[PDB]
Amino acid sequence: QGLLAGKRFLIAGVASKLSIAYGIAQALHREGAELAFTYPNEKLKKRVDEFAEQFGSKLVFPCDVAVDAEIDNAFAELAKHWDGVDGVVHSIGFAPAHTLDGDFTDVTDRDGFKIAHDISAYSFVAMARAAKPLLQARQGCLLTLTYQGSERVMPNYNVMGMAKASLEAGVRYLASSLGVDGIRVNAISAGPIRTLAASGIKSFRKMLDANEKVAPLKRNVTIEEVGNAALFLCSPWASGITGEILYVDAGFNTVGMSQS
Amino acid sequence: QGLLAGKRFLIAGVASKLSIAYGIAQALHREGAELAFTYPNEKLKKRVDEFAEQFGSKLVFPCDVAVDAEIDNAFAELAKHWDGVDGVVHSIGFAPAHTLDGDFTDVTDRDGFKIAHDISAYSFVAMARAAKPLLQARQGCLLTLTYQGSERVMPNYNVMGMAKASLEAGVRYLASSLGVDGIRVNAISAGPIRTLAASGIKSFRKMLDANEKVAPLKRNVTIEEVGNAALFLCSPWASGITGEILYVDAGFNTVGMSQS
Amino acid sequence: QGLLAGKRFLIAGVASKLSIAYGIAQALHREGAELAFTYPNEKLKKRVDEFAEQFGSKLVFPCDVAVDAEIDNAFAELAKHWDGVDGVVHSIGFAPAHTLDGDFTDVTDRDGFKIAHDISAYSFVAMARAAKPLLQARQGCLLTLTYQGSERVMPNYNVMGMAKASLEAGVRYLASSLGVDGIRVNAISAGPIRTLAASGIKSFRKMLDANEKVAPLKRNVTIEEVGNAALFLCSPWASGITGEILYVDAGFNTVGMSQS
Amino acid sequence: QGLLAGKRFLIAGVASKLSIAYGIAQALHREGAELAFTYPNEKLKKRVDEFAEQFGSKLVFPCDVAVDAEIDNAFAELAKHWDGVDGVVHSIGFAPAHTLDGDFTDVTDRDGFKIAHDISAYSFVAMARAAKPLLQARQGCLLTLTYQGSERVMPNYNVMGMAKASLEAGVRYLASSLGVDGIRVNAISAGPIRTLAASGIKSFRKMLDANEKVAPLKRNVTIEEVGNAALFLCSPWASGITGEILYVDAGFNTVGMSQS
């Protein structure tokens, strides 16, 4: 038996096999978890069904976190199939491209700010409410991904750095609120990894090349290592850890100035 | 001839004689600065006109930071009068009443999140964009107010924690964007202060009494030490300080666990 | 197999069955690890022989970290039995009772300060150096314990706060130095736990009680939960992690102010 | 008059006209402070009398911070002239050369650890204790200098980072220990400036080049910009500010990764 024998986990935000969430899906399944999966939109449905089956899963649901009623239904639809759940993994984030390309002051407009924070920060609080019942059942847990662009400035990150800072404070507030029920809320801050949201971004190459040089382990981290770190926080080995941001970035955050 | 002699400062967020905005206006004036002012809406037009008079000022303009026209217009209006400005002081913050009262997961709703972040965080960026031409002239600087509820959970603060965390990251993103022009960007993390944004609230009472016991100096902060600290971060004595979050809370944030 | 099958770990700082290093050992053996052990003075030896016998181990050595030869010695003595080690686990700390018993200014003399930083902080840098040859073979990994009394004031803790601050800086620096050799350095900020360090102290309970009231999971943490976190940080599941301070304190570090 | 109208201030650690101590003293004298100085060893005495002459001071005393006797005497010898005192500025920092030149794990020996901590971290505590009676009288304040080597890795800083972290904790433990006598205790974390610590070192030249590139204000900071921030923390404008590490580094600390 694996560490999560006969446990249930919903995984929000699986678009491709390069995803962080795919790396998280692998790891949990490896340790004998039973996965459910949400999809954002009808175009993604067939691919998420293929990914679901790859993890021996037939529990797929449409959930666009921009809509309230999709969040409510997607967990009311899950409540039919499962009478409880051990963890929900939030691995969602978005910003309009125009707010990510350039200098923060000019391109950061109201509507792009409003979306960044809605999808990337409020979805997690929305999802935490719509899960609270099925989580209370098994004293389950929450996991989200964040980026250190929130604590310190990173080129081009811009309005995401704010929406990610909102989300990390939001982790600590969910943790205190849901603590009394036995639910743990945690996040991982991942180093840069090549996925869909990095597709063809030219900054990303140089920026990964910089992260590789600056980091203490002299390499960029893998979706495998983010998967294993997530698993730990989704497991009973992390029962004393709530409210935590776990940096999985080779120790890049700890470096103030690199020799060359 | 005080420290700020023949300098100009727009002060955004004066609603009463209790306000941190008021305290800041007092000490900047007390050092010989030419203040301009803004007011949210028509109902607060007279009271601010009255508070404007007090500091030799007649440069009062309408600014609801919810609307994009009103932000840009009021920064043209001022550009007729002034051809330069040494500082802008953001001191605006709002969240709907039901978001600041209950269980975080239970009470915190999509629009309440949108609104809180929109007024309490994006307004700062929007004002920095609008204020950018004038500040370029004098190589001036920005200042906003934040609360350590972002960094560590406080009771009944909830989504404002998420909104302040977003604002504080914003301060750093601005610090880097506008730093090429000598424009500084800082914030003050004020202890709790009975100002207008706590009246009718019986929790805030208990909150000030706790703060007095935990704080090292064993006393709350009113608005004149927050005012004098804003004076400092707005003076040429802080020419080397940008992107800072200065804690004006008589040490509260350093205490891990206070005796009883 | 267990996760740590065919892996070797040294455990420095086993005093009693209340100890954290004791708890750590139980976790590591439970997943198939072959432990070594150390003892500081002659009076401890047989108790450490007996704890080592409980984990199927006759690798028990003298290592008083006050003495350089005794640190240099044991890692030559270990070098006979093992060609390569998968990690040292530093779990040593000390301060003269009189320094942890009163007002910080009144009681913090030069020798107290000297011992505190020598045993609790410096030692980790020495035992990193002594252990580096055996660590490079299997790309092993270090791990010390710390208390959040470094980052915020806890009453009585006093000089150990400055020692732990030094130690946590010790971690980030070693992590950069030894990263090049593939080595991971990490710490755990454990919540307060009743162990032989507190045995005689009245005020520690009132401190343990406070933690339970403030912490979001409303409970203290066990040497098991610390132990299980230390297993994860010593494994291939934490290969993407170095320089981290992982809080295992049921989320006490996230709360600025708790209901009552 | 200026801000510090007939206040008294002690300045430990003026080495030359390039020192921060000197630069602070200057800015403190500008606002009407009567200054007293100390010197370390018999060589520096004339130079420190020569400098103390520049600012109106014949109050100059011998104080090697390695020795307890000269601390208790220096504050007994000051107590003759001055009945009370308004602040003590601690600009003392020292580590061996060998410890600040190489790989961290190799060059850090027990004695170099003990010197770096004992001088750069304990000296600040020891002086606060001797200076209590005089400080208590005028409800005076303490200031110290630190480097963000404590919080993140800057190359070749090595064991000093452990001492600056140790120090930065002591600022908090002293802020809460001496807080009940209305004594404020703060530190300035200063950007890199060329001083007598930098003289002879060649890495320093390169480290300022990068710090200028990275820092949002595109410039290093001046002893006058550190002077005027110290002034603020030693003044009545900072009465709500204790236990603070104020960054005066052109916002370098706020940058995760600079473009280029």
Ligand SMILES: NC(=O)c1ccc[n+]([C@@H]2O[C@H](COP(=O)([O-])OP(=O)(O)OC[C@H]3O[C@@H](n4cnc5c(N)ncnc54)[C@H](O)[C@@H]3O)[C@@H](O)[C@H]2O)c1
């Ligand atoms: N890429 C990195 O190196 C990195 C580093 C740190 C943190 N992260 C975080 O990891 C998370 C996962 O991103 P990723 O790296 O796997 O990239 P990704 O683009 O594959 O993942 C983001 C996911 O968000 C989903 N999503 C977008 N809008 C949605 C909506 N309205 N409703 C529902 N789902 C929606 C997408 O379908 C997608 O699967 C993000 O929140 C990101 O900020 C990534």
Ligand SMILES: NC(=O)c1ccc[n+]([C@@H]2O[C@H](COP(=O)([O-])OP(=O)(O)OC[C@H]3O[C@@H](n4cnc5c(N)ncnc54)[C@H](O)[C@@H]3O)[C@@H](O)[C@H]2O)c1
């Ligand atoms: N009082 C505290 O405990 C404390 C501590 C730290 C920081 N802060 C923050 O400092 C700032 C100042 O608050 P305050 O203490 O002066 O209270 P306040 O109510 O006097 O000030 C808030 C200001 O925001 C303005 N405002 C609200 N909604 C607006 C809108 N739609 N458009 C434009 N202006 C709008 C109000 O007119 C008012 O002037 C806020 O951001 C607050 O959150 C408060």
Ligand SMILES: NC(=O)c1ccc[n+]([C@@H]2O[C@H](COP(=O)([O-])OP(=O)(O)OC[C@H]3O[C@@H](n4cnc5c(N)ncnc54)[C@H](O)[C@@H]3O)[C@@H](O)[C@H]2O)c1
């Ligand atoms: N228990 C807590 O509240 C707590 C919380 C966080 C961190 N910590 C830290 O974790 C570590 C483990 O503490 P513990 O709870 O296991 O206490 P413990 O007393 O059970 O273990 C401390 C160990 O340090 C050893 N030690 C003391 N002086 C030594 C010396 N000169 N040379 C070598 N070894 C020496 C002791 O003999 C013992 O084995 C310490 O560094 C402590 O500061 C403790």
Ligand SMILES: NC(=O)c1ccc[n+]([C@@H]2O[C@H](COP(=O)([O-])OP(=O)(O)OC[C@H]3O[C@@H](n4cnc5c(N)ncnc54)[C@H](O)[C@@H]3O)[C@@H](O)[C@H]2O)c1
């Ligand atoms: N300049 C920078 O780059 C920089 C940046 C951040 C922090 N700092 C810190 O600021 C402080 C001032 O450094 P500086 O730039 O003026 O260099 P400096 O060497 O000129 O000043 C340090 C002072 O410490 C004194 N000192 C050393 N050992 C002593 C002892 N045993 N007893 C008494 N006095 C002793 C010296 O006499 C000297 O005046 C130090 O703590 C330094 O670590 C410097």
